[PDB]
Amino acid sequence: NAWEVNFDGLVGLTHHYAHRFQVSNPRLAAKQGLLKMKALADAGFPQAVIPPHERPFIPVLRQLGFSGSDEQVLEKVARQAPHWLSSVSSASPMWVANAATIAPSADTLDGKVHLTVANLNNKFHRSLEAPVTESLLKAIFNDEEKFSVHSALPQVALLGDEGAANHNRLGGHYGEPGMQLFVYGREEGNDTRPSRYPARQTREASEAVARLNQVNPQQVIFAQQNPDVIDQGVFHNDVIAVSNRQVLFCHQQAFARQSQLLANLRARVNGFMAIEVPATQVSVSDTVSTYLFNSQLLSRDDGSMMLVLPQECREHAGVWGYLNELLAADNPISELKVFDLRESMANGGGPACLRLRVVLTEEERRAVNPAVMMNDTLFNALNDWVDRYYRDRLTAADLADPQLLREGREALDVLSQLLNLGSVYPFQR
Amino acid sequence: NAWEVNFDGLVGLTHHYAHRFQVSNPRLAAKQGLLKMKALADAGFPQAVIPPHERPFIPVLRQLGFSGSDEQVLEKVARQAPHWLSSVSSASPMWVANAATIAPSADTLDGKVHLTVANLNNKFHRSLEAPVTESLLKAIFNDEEKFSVHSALPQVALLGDEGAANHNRLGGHYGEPGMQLFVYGREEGNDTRPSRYPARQTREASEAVARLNQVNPQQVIFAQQNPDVIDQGVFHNDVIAVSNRQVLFCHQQAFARQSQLLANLRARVNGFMAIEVPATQVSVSDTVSTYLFNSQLLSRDDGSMMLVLPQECREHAGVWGYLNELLAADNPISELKVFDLRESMANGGGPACLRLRVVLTEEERRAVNPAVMMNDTLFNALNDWVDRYYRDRLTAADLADPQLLREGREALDVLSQLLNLGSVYPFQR
Ligand SMILES: [K+]
Numbered sequence: 001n002a003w004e005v006n007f008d009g010l011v012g013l014t015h016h017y018a019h020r021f022q023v024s025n026p027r028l029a030a031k032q033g034l035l036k037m038k039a040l041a042d043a044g045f046p047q048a049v050i051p052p053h054e055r056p057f058i059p060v061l062r063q064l065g066f067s068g069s070d071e072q073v074l075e076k077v078a079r080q081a082p083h084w085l086s087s088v089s090s091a092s093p094m095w096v097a098n099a100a101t102i103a104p105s106a107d108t109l110d111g112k113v114h115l116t117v118a119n120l121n122n123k124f125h126r127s128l129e130a131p132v133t134e135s136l137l138k139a140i141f142n143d144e145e146k147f148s149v150h151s152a153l154p155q156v157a158l159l160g161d162e163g164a165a166n167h168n169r170l171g172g173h174y175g176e177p178g179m180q181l182f183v184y185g186r187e188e189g190n191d192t193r194p195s196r197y198p199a200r201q202t203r204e205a206s207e208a209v210a211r212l213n214q215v216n217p218q219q220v221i222f223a224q225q226n227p228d229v230i231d232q233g234v235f236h237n238d239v240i241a242v243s244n245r246q247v248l249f250c251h252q253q254a255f256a257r258q259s260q261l262l263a264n265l266r267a268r269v270n271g272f273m274a275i276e277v278p279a280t281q282v283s284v285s286d287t288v289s290t291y292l293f294n295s296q297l298l299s300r301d302d303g304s305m306m307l308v309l310p311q312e313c314r315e316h317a318g319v320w321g322y323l324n325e326l327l328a329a330d331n332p333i334s335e336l337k338v339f340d341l342r343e344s345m346a347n348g349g350g351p352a353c354l355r356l357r358v359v360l361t362e363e364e365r366r367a368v369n370p371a372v373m374m375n376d377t378l379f380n381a382l383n384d385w386v387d388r389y390y391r392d393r394l395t396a397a398d399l400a401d402p403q404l405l406r407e408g409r410e411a412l413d414v415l416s417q418l419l420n421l422g423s424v425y426p427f428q429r
Numbered sequence: 430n431a432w433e434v435n436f437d438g439l440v441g442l443t444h445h446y447a448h449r450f451q452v453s454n455p456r457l458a459a460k461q462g463l464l465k466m467k468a469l470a471d472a473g474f475p476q477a478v479i480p481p482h483e484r485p486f487i488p489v490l491r492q493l494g495f496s497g498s499d500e501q502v503l504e505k506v507a508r509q510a511p512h513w514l515s516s517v518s519s520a521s522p523m524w525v526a527n528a529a530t531i532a533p534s535a536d537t538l539d540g541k542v543h544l545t546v547a548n549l550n551n552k553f554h555r556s557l558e559a560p561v562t563e564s565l566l567k568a569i570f571n572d573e574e575k576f577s578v579h580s581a582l583p584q585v586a587l588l589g590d591e592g593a594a595n596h597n598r599l600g601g602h603y604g605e606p607g608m609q610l611f612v613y614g615r616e617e618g619n620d621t622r623p624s625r626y627p628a629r630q631t632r633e634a635s636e637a638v639a640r641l642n643q644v645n646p647q648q649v650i651f652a653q654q655n656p657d658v659i660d661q662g663v664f665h666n667d668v669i670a671v672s673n674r675q676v677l678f679c680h681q682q683a684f685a686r687q688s689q690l691l692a693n694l695r696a697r698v699n700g701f702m703a704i705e706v707p708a709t710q711v712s713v714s715d716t717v718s719t720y721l722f723n724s725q726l727l728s729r730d731d732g733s734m735m736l737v738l739p740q741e742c743r744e745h746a747g748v749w750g751y752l753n754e755l756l757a758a759d760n761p762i763s764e765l766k767v768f769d770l771r772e773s774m775a776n777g778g779g780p781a782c783l784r785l786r787v788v789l790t791e792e793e794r795r796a797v798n799p800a801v802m803m804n805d806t807l808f809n810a811l812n813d814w815v816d817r818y819y820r821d822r823l824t825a826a827d828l829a830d831p832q833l834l835r836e837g838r839e840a841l842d843v844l845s846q847l848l849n850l851g852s853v854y855p856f857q858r
Pocket residue numbers: 326327328329330331332333334
């Protein structure tokens with residue numbers, strides 16, 4: 001039987017702000033993330049980890065015209081065009097919800113697990129991720145008889161893809177064929193689209209990923225996000241809705257043709273249950289500020305569920321009130337769990353943004369690189385690694401420091417050994 | 430003694446329309462282009478050629494999720510999503526003015542000729558060109574002691590680059606250090622930008638290419654295109670202005686701060702002469718429909734110049750009238766030459782769009798692959814090749830034909846032998 005395994009992103013050393021804060025705490029950011037990972041693991045929810053990337057990323061600076069040695073390039077950019085430093089030093093890869101789109105073997109035509117890297121074309125600093133993200137996935141899901149990793153879609157606005165963050169999977173047990181729901185923000189020919197915040201996900205992209213992941217045509221549904229919610233701050237579906245098994249926890253203003261979509265899911269998903277949060281109870285604004293929907297909806301063995309939320313949801317009387325009501329109402333959600341993720345939330349990432357859901361059978365679980373599976377040993381090893389290399393204070397100005405560069409290179413080289421990934425980074429090649 | 434050599438694009442076999450004409454004539458399109466090439470060569474203007482690309486381009490269709498053999502992929506796309514066929518079968522590479530940005534050795538810090546491939550990120554069908562365009566340039570400008578080809582900038586809207594079409598070079602003799610003028614349509618932070626037709630060229634990209642091409646900082650000027658002209662159809666600078674030696678032939682509504690730009694050129698370029706066409710005489714509309722500014726401004730040995738224009742300029746009484754006046758006025762232009770380029774103009778390409786200007790010293794000219802330099806032998810060989818493989822009629826519907834695919838592959842394989850390029854195309858690797 002298959003279980004849903006969460007793969008979380010280990011915050012990188014250059015985590016920074018580019019709130020009125022300019023000083024970040026990389027070390028604390030990583031520790032907060034590790035704590036969430038460990039807690040869930042300890043509670044019985046399969047957990048794994050995905051490492052940070054090479055930052056600053058000098059290769060793209062060379063692509064931009066700066067030549068010399070890594071340190072000279074860094075110096076030239078610092079002196080001539082320092083704004084690029086921030087753009088090539090983001091710890092954004094930590095939000096693995098955007099790393100790729102997953103298709104469990106129960107939904108594929110060739111019976112293998114498929115993962116398609118997201119190009120993340122809309123944002124320059126995130127578009128840099130794809131190549132390295134592909135290497136990491138291939139080093140983690142290395143067994144080609146069980147896993148199939150596809151390269152990201154062409155890097156153009158027409159095929160903007162933000163991955164799992166806009167993906168959903170509904171059904172009975174995880175191991176059974178499920179219904180996949182792809183949410184997009186825009187499509188060619190459709191005049192209905194955001195007018196203040198461009199849509200990062202296009203239907204053309206979603207459909208291509210569906211194709212690449214060999215998804216059964218009858219087990220896929222494409223739905224357009226409500227354009228008005230996007231203009232309010234919902235840049236990904238995972239900020240206004242989340243799914244798990246037969247449940248779809250969403251805001252009433254989440255989808256363009258919501259009524260139609262839900263009815264369709266009810267007809268196609270056995271026992272499907274939609275939990276819509278009316279705007280009266282919680283507004284879109286409240287949703288965006290608390291990240292109520294960027295929560296993880298987990299399943300226990302008895303069929304009950306747990307909601308993992310960021311601290312902002314508890315600090316908001318209105319949302320907390322709603323959650324306690326939901327807890328007592330007639331539905332699977334029987335527990336609420338809150339985590340302090342201030343560092344990630346400062347840059348726009350909640351509990352779900354930091355994780356990538358991968359349903360794996362018992363045999364597939366065994367095929368995954370064991371060095372990335374969470375347990376006491378990995379937890380302690382990572383914590384020590386963080387205490388050794390991560391700084392407690394960082395600003396954009398420190399990105400020009402050659403020593404930060406050197407520290408990050410050693411750190412990643414040591415981590416690649418710890419996670420048994422080999423020479424997975426560009427600088428190692 | 431350096432000369433400016435024109436490298437024209439040989440129209441590909443899939444030239445088609447995706448006016449209301451639906452039937453294209455690939456063969457005629459190629460022959461019209463060859464005729465212009467030959468005429469200029471015969472008149473004494475150094476001329477060379479750049480081959481078409483692999484079309485349909487199946488590899489991108491696979492990236493989009495269609496698997497199987499080349500024929501099956503083609504079949505699946507034709508049946509499932511036929512609109513992709515057109516987007517991967519464009520003969521757009523013919524407009525080599527967008528292939529890359531050139532820096533003559535007289536302007537470079539390392540004394541070599543630099544060529545940076547344009548990403549052409551704005552349009553999906555043209556963004557496919559970069560990789561193959563890079564291989565072709567490296568096979569034509571193969572001597573690395575004389576030429577340096579740099580890969581295209583990252584494929585993101587922030588770094589949209591359309592190449593030479595937005596470039597200009599002013600100065601005395603071609604071989605002397607010249608003043609480079611980079612024209613862009615938008616830049617970050619600048620609220621001044623097109624509002625109807627997105628700007629394909631960003632200042633950030635222009636500046637990066639300037640760096641890649643090792644351009645002397647004092648020999649470069651960045652100027653913003655007038656946003657109002659862009660919204661009227663001027664998607665590239667070579668549709669509203671053209672330079673040559675000490676002359677800059679442009680429309681009065683060409684640049685944002687025109688007065689300041691021209692005064693600056695007057696101060697930095699000896700003998701600089703700006704020929705501004707007032708709106709009263711020729712409107713922007715007239716400009717866009719006739720392609721008056723997408724003309725080639727050539728130099729003869731005595732210092733006189735010749736304007737190479739598309740038929741549309743002669744057919745427009747107003748523009749033709751202005752040209753005759755310009756010919757008699759006090760300036761270097763002493764001759765007008767018109768060519769029939771209806772096929773290319775049908776898709777938005779005039780004489781200049783079909784050519785890439787490369788200033789080369791005598792030694793550099795000798796270093797260029799001799800097999801692509803224009804002469805009677807190459808001219809006759811190419812015309813025969815065209816007659817053998819090009820169809821007289823074509824529509825988007827024919828792009829699904831496996832036989833057209835096979836014809837194009839053999840044609841390109843034979844052409845690669847004729848032009849002594851080796852296995853330069855993906856299908857040959
Ligand atoms: K409940």
